[PDB]
Amino acid sequence: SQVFGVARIYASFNDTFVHVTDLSGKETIARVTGGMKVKADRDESSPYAAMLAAQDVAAKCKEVGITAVHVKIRATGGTRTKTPGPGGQAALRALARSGLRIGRIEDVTPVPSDSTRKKGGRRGRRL
Amino acid sequence: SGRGAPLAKVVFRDPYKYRLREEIFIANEGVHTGQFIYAGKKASLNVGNVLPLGSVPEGTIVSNVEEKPGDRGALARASGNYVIIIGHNPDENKTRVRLPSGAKKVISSDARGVIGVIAGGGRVDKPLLKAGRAFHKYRLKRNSWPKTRGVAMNPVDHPHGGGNHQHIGKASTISRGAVSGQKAGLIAARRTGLLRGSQKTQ
Amino acid sequence: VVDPFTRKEWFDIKAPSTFENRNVGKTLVNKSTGLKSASDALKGRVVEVCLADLQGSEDHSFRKIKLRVDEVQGKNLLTNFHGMDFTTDKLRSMVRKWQTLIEANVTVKTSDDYVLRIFAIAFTRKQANQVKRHSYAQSSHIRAIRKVISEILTKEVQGSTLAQLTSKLIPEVINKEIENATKDIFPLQNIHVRKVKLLKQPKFDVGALMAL
Amino acid sequence: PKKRASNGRNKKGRGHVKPVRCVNCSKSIPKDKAIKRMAIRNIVEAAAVRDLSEASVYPEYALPKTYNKLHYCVSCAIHARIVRVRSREDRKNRAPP
Amino acid sequence: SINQKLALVIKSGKYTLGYKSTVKSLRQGKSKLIIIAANTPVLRKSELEYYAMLSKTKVYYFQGGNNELGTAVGKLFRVGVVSILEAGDSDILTTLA
Amino acid sequence: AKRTKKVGITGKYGVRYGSSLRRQVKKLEIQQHARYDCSFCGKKTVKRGAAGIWTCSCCKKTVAGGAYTVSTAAAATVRSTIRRLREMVEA
Amino acid sequence: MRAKWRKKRTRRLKRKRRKVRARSK
RNA sequence: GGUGAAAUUCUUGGAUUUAUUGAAGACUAACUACUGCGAAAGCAUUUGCCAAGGACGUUUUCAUUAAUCAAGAACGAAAGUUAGGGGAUCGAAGAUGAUCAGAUACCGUCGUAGUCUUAACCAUAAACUAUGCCGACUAGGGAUCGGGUGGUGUUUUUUUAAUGACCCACUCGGCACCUUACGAGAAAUCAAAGUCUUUGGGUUCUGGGGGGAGUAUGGUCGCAAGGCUGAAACUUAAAGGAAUUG
RNA sequence: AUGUUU
């Protein structure tokens, strides 16, 4: 009874991507990033920027005809963080509050089987 | 003589006339005298057998591989060299192979190869240790040794000749579009200097 | 200034043949042109749909199903089983401390032509009256359990087609078979077939595909 | 002197333990020494649970959780206050708070 | 195992080592079982098989070469084929196949 | 008695060609002049003819092999790979 | 100075002494 | 993209993101624990083969064959060396962007050797439990691993029962832990670091204030880096350990 | 985030 897309929210640090595509994912509809909605070079990951980007993505989606979205949230993954950035929650808030329906939320963060020796050296980042 | 790899004399029966046909294959490692060699589309996957590239599974190691079907062997013929089957394209039948140089080639699936690696491997690991040994090596191949450096010649003899010190004088990297008499040095070199890092650019 | 969505037309992914429900959703693609056919742009798309959204029963919220479009037939994408996997949240919820995790993987050929890799998972469990707080296995019970699971998976496959294997995965009868064959080794609370992977497809066989 | 009765780690009868990288700074720390915290969070943390239950097309969706084991080095754990400096007697307390 | 039974036959029973004595025993009908080394030439193995078929003698194919067969029969030389004339107090004759 | 401490067969080269080159040559000359077990008759009678040819003085069987050893590790790996692929093809 | 860096400086000094002694004969 | 903030960098040759595949090499997450094995270094995907090992059980066998060990040998993290293969990631060097007063440091982007493997070296680590090995004795307790013993035991079916898992109790061996210490210690603390001026079970190694100095020299080992052995002159009244209060 | 000596 609805037209389903896929939200594919990639919420890293320093940026959050709101990228709605079709069910397969081959075709994308209105991929908007948190950096496109703020000019500070540091607010691109911020919840306000993520909310604005997701509002724009939802507005453009419901002119194409996407009424509901299955939700796939990911962090950077690989070997870097495993933890979603601050903007994923705001992006999901704006997606749910802009009229789009929500379905099948999932965490698709890439998780290795202990591969890819991590960047930073054995003494880590020294701050 | 002049070849590192040993040759195998394989005798077959002539299917159309009563007589024997001796063929000179490049012996693969493990091939022995008195061994039965099977060659054809329906021969088994055994070392020394000659099979079409399409009839072997991915990962098969072949040698004396034909570039075109019926050319009787072009690729991976030197001692210790071999070709790796990496996959087949059954529609418009082609087999992807990796050559000894590391290059990926698409060959007709009807082209044949000998299962195994060419015998005589590890040959270049032994230092020649002697100008005499290099002399006897090239005596049975060709008159390409010894080599006088072009920089040790006079200008009339070579582009590198002349000068009050031995030096090239201009870049030794020579354009591919240069003409005969100019192509001395590093012809059409993409890069120069000591190679550091990984090969197989893509 | 192009608006690429003006030239895109919608299609309906009539994806399964027997799961519970024909309709799974819609997808859009560029309209057919001379040098770029929409039928070519389609027919390779893989869609991941929840087994609960395929069966109508909420007890299938995990075990997503991959379906690859095998044929584009008049706004109807007729697909077939392409693979299944548990959800990350479900898998992490079953993977708990103070218990032994047992994993088994088999590479099998189905009855007709299909090559699959089956990953099954199981976890040791506490008894009703256990005082011990971890309930670990003895690394030979693990080997016996892995052997039993491998035999069970290689017997369930090699005796059924891809569609029959799918229709046996939906009820989770393999989980019950593993439980019955392993209850004499270790409790194994959480037996599951966590993943089915399609390794090599046979010839297209449009006749066999045309079952929906 | 020796600050901790066994060590600042958990390794007796082991000898060597494979290292893990701190999730915060990527410092290599032996796995038995690293501070390990399981983070099991709701995907929608606290505020938009109502909004997502309203926008959901499924009644009683029972939204999932994100599970993530965080491995910290000692310096990063102390800086982020996952662990804290304790009194000499309070250090001899292994029960979680 | 097979090596143990062979050692028991060597120490207690009667046997012949080698191709000529094995063929002589096969043609004399006093061979109960012939054990053929893995690396035995195929023509010789086939002819021994034919003799054993003619004399109704069991054939066991030793998994090792002639060196291994000699070691198993407790000798310091290569043995390509062993012929058992009397098994002695050993179950090599019945516990095969 | 031990006539040479380390040069071994390369004592014929005297002080020439460098110690590293003499060592590298020594390893492969030992390999190429070693006696190997015949895989057909079980005797330690296989010796090199020309490079890549290894003949058993007993049973007169010659096998194509490596330049300085009867079987290179690459050839052993290729034999195992071919056996595995043949087994997969047959079953 | 750190004992490790003292050891490294001493090793460099030993290498320099070995070179200067080898150059003489 | 990256950061605290930036910049180097990539980007209408469409960067980043998304989907279907492919290739390469590395690693073996979660399970993973005050848990296991090994002489130590170390060892974490499955399965197959090969030999090995502790503990347990034993009314099996020998009968002192034993303990510790100069000289002498085997193994020995990482880094490093030689020659091949491989070279995804990270990454000494190097190049760069930013900060700074300077910053060829921390932070950022690349990136060679290396990181991986075969064949040879190297033989060093806060190679740590900073606690030699063997033997006996001197408190209590609960866990846990492996084996064994017993039970009107719970649970699983084969058809009596049996194993499997679990509970209770005991026991041997092990990783450890908690309390108290008769006791020990300078104390921190220690079931050993106790059974020491009431001083002796056996044995090996090492130290004699701090530097100079693990230096010089000699010998020896190594391809090298270096390893092992190792002074003296001279100089100095402290250096150091634990704990207390600020 | 940084701020040099006594």
Ligand SMILES: [K+]
């Ligand atoms: K940012």
Ligand SMILES: [K+]
């Ligand atoms: K010149």
Ligand SMILES: [K+]
């Ligand atoms: K590299």
Ligand SMILES: [Mg+2]
């Ligand atoms: Mg940015």
Ligand SMILES: [Mg+2]
């Ligand atoms: Mg800090």
Ligand SMILES: [Mg+2]
């Ligand atoms: Mg030359």
Ligand SMILES: [Mg+2]
């Ligand atoms: Mg010259």
Ligand SMILES: [Mg+2]
């Ligand atoms: Mg001249």
Ligand SMILES: [Mg+2]
């Ligand atoms: Mg000229």
Ligand SMILES: [Mg+2]
């Ligand atoms: Mg010129």
Ligand SMILES: [Mg+2]
């Ligand atoms: Mg001149």
Ligand SMILES: [Mg+2]
């Ligand atoms: Mg301190």
Ligand SMILES: [Mg+2]
């Ligand atoms: Mg250690």
Ligand SMILES: [Mg+2]
């Ligand atoms: Mg694992």
Ligand SMILES: [Mg+2]
């Ligand atoms: Mg364990």
Ligand SMILES: [Mg+2]
């Ligand atoms: Mg000694």
